[PDB]
Amino acid sequence: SAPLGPFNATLLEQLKNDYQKGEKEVTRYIELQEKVAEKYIKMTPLSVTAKKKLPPSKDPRDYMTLSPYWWPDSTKIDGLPYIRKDGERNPEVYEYPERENANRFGDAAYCLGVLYYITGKEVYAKACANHLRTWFTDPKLGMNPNMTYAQAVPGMKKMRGSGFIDSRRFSRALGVAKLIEGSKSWTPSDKKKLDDWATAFCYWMENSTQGQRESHAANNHGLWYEAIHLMVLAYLDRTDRIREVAEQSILPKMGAQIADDGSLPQELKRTLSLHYSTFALEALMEANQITSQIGINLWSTPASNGKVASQAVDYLYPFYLNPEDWKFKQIKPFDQSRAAILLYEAGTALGNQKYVDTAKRIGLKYSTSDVETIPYLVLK
Amino acid sequence: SAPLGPFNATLLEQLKNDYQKGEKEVTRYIELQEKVAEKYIKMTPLSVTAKKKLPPSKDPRDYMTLSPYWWPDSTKIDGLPYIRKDGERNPEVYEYPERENANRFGDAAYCLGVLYYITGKEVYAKACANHLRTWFTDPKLGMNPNMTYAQAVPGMKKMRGSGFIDSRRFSRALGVAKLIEGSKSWTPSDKKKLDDWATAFCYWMENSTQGQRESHAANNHGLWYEAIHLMVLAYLDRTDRIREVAEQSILPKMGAQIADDGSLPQELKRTLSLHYSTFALEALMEANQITSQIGINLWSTPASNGKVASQAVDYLYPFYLNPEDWKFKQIKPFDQSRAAILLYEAGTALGNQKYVDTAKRIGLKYSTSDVETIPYLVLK
Ligand SMILES: O=C(O)C1=C[C@H](O)[C@H](O)[C@H](O[C@H]2[C@H](O)[C@H](O)[C@H](O[C@H]3[C@H](O)[C@H](O)[C@H](O)O[C@@H]3C(=O)O)O[C@@H]2C(=O)O)O1
Ligand SMILES: O=C(O)C1=C[C@H](O)[C@H](O)[C@H](O[C@H]2[C@H](O)[C@H](O)[C@H](O[C@H]3[C@H](O)[C@H](O)[C@H](O)O[C@@H]3C(=O)O)O[C@@H]2C(=O)O)O1
């Protein structure tokens, strides 16, 4: 049985079982994934300290990014304070190296850790561990366990927790570290350091004002906060807290954010409303991968008002079939393929075979290098 | 009379004459522009050599960018060859510093040169000259006079001239250097070096295979090629060639690109078809700013085939009133404010009061720091 973590454990256990039996289709698929993963064996580990412009703490180990929809105001001599254009990414975001480097690290650690679980090859644990040590626990290169300066905004006077949603890029890699435990390359000292980092990160996100505020956000930020929260708690093996989070935070959030007709009105007021409805359900999808490993199905368990997450999928399904029929603001085209994994996840959790069939009809490319698609041979 | 250059010379002369007469409205506007321009006096001059990853020539003085719509192919192990997603800008473009640095230099040099022309204050010529020297003529920091590696694409086997369109961000700055001739800071030796650079760049764009190809492009690339061409030719005082380019290349190109209803079919097949319809006419607008300084009006002069550029403005005008009425693919919102200067330019050249009225109704923000709007107090 697969360790508790941020992945479809059923699909991952099935892939490993078939790989070890020498099942030909799976063996070839994993051999393709190994050719994809070679670049991560070669990759120099990234660090949040690889920036020149320091955060207000003067600590290069503090994560800092620009909130993506905030732009300099041309009518101000210094451009300050920045103003918001919902749905229009300011290219200035690429001036903060950790926005993309956290994504590159997360991909590399996720791919390598999953390949170690499937194949048992030490080379993948050794390379996974190298990325994990440098990003997380190194006393010089490792990130401080906080998101204080995530999605900062020039000129903004108030503190926000909005940037915490950036954590999902590296909290998935934190969770996969559970998969390399027991390797030779991941020592007891490595585990204790990362256990301590994860405990300090969990403390920060539960007790800092920014973490508290993000825990109560009325939209997909609150849903993603608990997805991240569950990844951290599952890394730390706190299964009682996972039950408590789902019952006391995730379910009440669903019950409030799903309307009677199954729409998500907080996402409907965005300029990318079909993307943000989908993104809210992707948060529930990642939360569910974890809750369902301990017996809780987030797709069909009702809130106290009887609302269920499947209602939100039902509402969106015809627009996954035909995005052009979407009737709310969507100022960039919607990528239909983001529905494939989502409809598969929800479909199998609900026994809804129309959803699974559509997940496969949409599908994913067999040879794609997108690391989140590794477990989904079933869609390829 | 203002020196020949890439600006509305009528508006620039009017601003200078009013400023010298102490007219209050103009004097206040220019004092705002002087506050805006302060950042450029302090800003450290940029150079194309400020890059890490070198181009295939191994020369940091070669300009190099990535063609913006080309992306790694995730179904290939190394992502190669890149594939095209029209209208979707790959954020990898920001890994090539001269993409945005050419923009920043172009803004800095344009603003300072225009302010030296209006105010006569030497401090603007001194700073303008500092930017010009470093970007263009410096024997270590100045760019080589070519665009061989502009908008290169990883894995593409053929040479393209498509990246030449990048030149417009610095060819306007080249044009404005004429405005600081006669200042104390811009010496005869300075002018001589920039004359030689511009002569070599003109040779490259006219005789290189890439320049030849871009000069033959049947869409807005061909229009921008000649607008840049006219800027280089005007800087070099080749008024006889300006006339020849207008009559033998620009007007025939414009006439071949306009369909019977005034639409631009080459731009209509783009995913950003309202933007590229406008971008094609913006090339003609900047070309006309120069030709009309020697008596050639590109908006009203018919081509050989009876087509005239006013017909294309006429087709687009209702969609400038209501961009939501646009019936062709436009996968990002169209910025209506780009119609302001365009309709003013075309309206004034055509004596079309309806166009000028809408230009002022749409308007530009009085306090904006966008350097391209400096001559347009009339719209603010
Ligand atoms: O929705 C997301 O997951 C998301 C991801 C991006 O990285 C940003 O974090 C972005 O955050 C949004 C946030 O979700 C809200 O829509 C918020 O809206 C508020 C505005 O910022 C203004 O303050 C407005 O007056 O009120 C809004 C509100 O509270 O509804 O904006 C942020 C943002 O763009 O920073 O979305
Ligand atoms: O239109 C522009 O000014 C423009 C600016 C961008 O920076 C790019 O240079 C982009 O160039 C376009 C170009 O205008 C054409 O649309 C071209 O189309 C060709 C495609 O690249 C393929 O080769 C296709 O098979 O044929 C197309 C054709 O010839 O119409 O694409 C480039 C580009 O995106 O590289 O536009």
Write A373-376 long-range contacts (CB < 8 A, 24+): A373/A341, A374/A33, A374/A110, A374/A111, A374/A114, A374/A115, A375/A7, A375/A8, A375/A11, A375/A12, A375/A15, A375/A114, A376/A8, A376/A11, A376/A340, A376/A341, A376/A344
Residue B25 structure tokens: 């409205």
Residue whose token pair is 């000292």: A189
d(CA A37, CA A126): 13
Query: How far B232 CA lies from chain A's nearest CA (Å)?
Result: 30
Give A 220-249 residues with CB within 8 A of chain B: none
Distance A223 CA to ligand 1 centre (A): 14
Residue from A305, A294, A308, A313 nearest A230 by CA: A294
Cα B49 vs. chain centroid, distance in angstroms? 22
Flag whether residue B87 sits within 8 Å of chain A, measured between CB atoms.
no
By the 10 Å C-beta count (0-12 exposed, 13-18 middle, 19+ buried), A44 is classed as exposed
Three-class DSSP category at A98 = helix
Resolution (A): 1.8
Count of other CB atoms within 10 angstroms of residue A29: 20
Residue A306 DSSP symbol: S
Check the CA dihedral B110-B111-B117-B121 and report its sign. negative
Cβ A237 vs Cβ A222: under 8 Å = no
Residue whose token pair is 């997909």: A220
Interface test with A, best of B332, B334, B366 (most A CBs within 10 A): B332
Measured CA angle at A284 (ends A282, A290), to 5 deg: 110
Three-class DSSP category at B224 = helix
Q: Is the peptide bond before B81 cis (omega within 30 degrees of 0)?
A: yes
Residue B334 DSSP symbol: -
Cβ A2 vs Cβ A13: under 8 Å = yes
- Ligand 1: residues with CB < 6 A are A 67-69, 84, 86, 151, 162, 165, 219-221, 276, 279
**Pairing of the two strands A64-66 and B83-84:** unpaired
Residue from A197, A205, A234, A203 nearest A222 by CA: A205
Distance B87 CA to ligand 2 centre (A): 10
A35: chain B residues, CB-CB within 8 Å: 77
Residue whose token pair is 């983001």: A338
DSSP string, A186-210: S-HHHHHHHHHHHHHHHHHHHHSHH
d(CA B54, CA B98): 12
Flag whether residue B333 sits within 8 Å of chain A, measured between CB atoms.
yes
In chain A, where the domains are located: 9-379
Cβ B110 vs Cβ B172: under 8 Å = yes
Evaluate: CB of B67 within 6 angstroms of ligand 2.
yes
Cβ B345 vs Cβ B292: under 8 Å = no
Query: Using the beta-carbon criterion (under 8 Å), do A367 and B331 form an inter-chain contact?
Result: no
Q: Quick one: which atom of ligand 1 is closest to the CA of A163?
A: 9
Cβ A138 vs Cβ A115: under 8 Å = no
Flag whether residue B76 sits within 8 Å of chain A, measured between CB atoms.
yes
d(CA B364, CA B362): 7
Q: Quick one: which atom of ligand 1 is closest to the CA of A69?
A: 34
Superfamily, domain A9-379: Chondroitin AC/alginate lyase (1.50.10.100)
A333: chain B residues, CB-CB within 8 Å: 331
Q: CB within 8 A of A167, min separation 6: which ones? A: A147, A150, A205, A228
d(CA B173, CA B127): 13
Size of interface A-B (CB pairs under 8 A): 37
d(CA A47, CA A63): 10
Specify the DSSP element, H or E, that contains A376: none
Check residue A73 and give left, alpha or beta (phi > 0: left; psi -120 to 50: alpha): beta
Check the CA dihedral B21-B23-B26-B32 and report its sign. positive
- Name beta bridge partners: B84: B70
d(CA B159, CA B212): 12
- Name beta bridge partners: A70: A84
d(CA A128, CA A115): 10
Which ranges of A292-328 would DSSP assign to H, the alpha helix?
309-321
DSSP string, B138-169: -TTTSPPS--TEEEE-TT--S---GGGGGGHH
Atom 18 (ligand 1): residue with closest C-alpha? A86
Per-residue CA distances from A222 to A175, A266, A284, A288, B316 (Å)? 20, 11, 10, 15, 44
Atom 6 (ligand 2): residue with closest C-alpha? B68
Cα torsion at B127, B130, B132, B134 (round to 10°)? -150
Residue B185 DSSP symbol: S
Query: How far A16 CA lies from chain B's nearest CA (Å)?
Result: 23
* Residue to mutate, B82, B103, B213, B221, ligand 2, most ligand atoms under 8 Å from C-beta: B221
d(CA B209, CA B160): 9
Residue from B260, B289, B270 nearest B110 by CA: B289
Distance B199 CA to ligand 2 centre (A): 28
A370: chain B residues, CB-CB within 8 Å: 74
Residue B66 DSSP symbol: E
Count of other CB atoms within 10 angstroms of residue B171: 25
Counting every residue written for chain A, the total comes to 380
Give A 138-177 residues with CB within 8 A of chain B: none
Residue from B132, B133, B168 nearest B150 by CA: B168
Note the ligand closest to the C-alpha atom of B70: 2
Residue whose token pair is 């053929």: B158
Residue A278 structure tokens: 């989908």
DSSP string, A156-179: --S---GGGGGGHHHHHHHHHGGG
d(CA A162, CA A280): 15
Residue whose token pair is 């030490």: A122
Residue whose token pair is 């075309």: B346
Query: How far B238 CA lies from chain A's nearest CA (Å)?
Result: 37
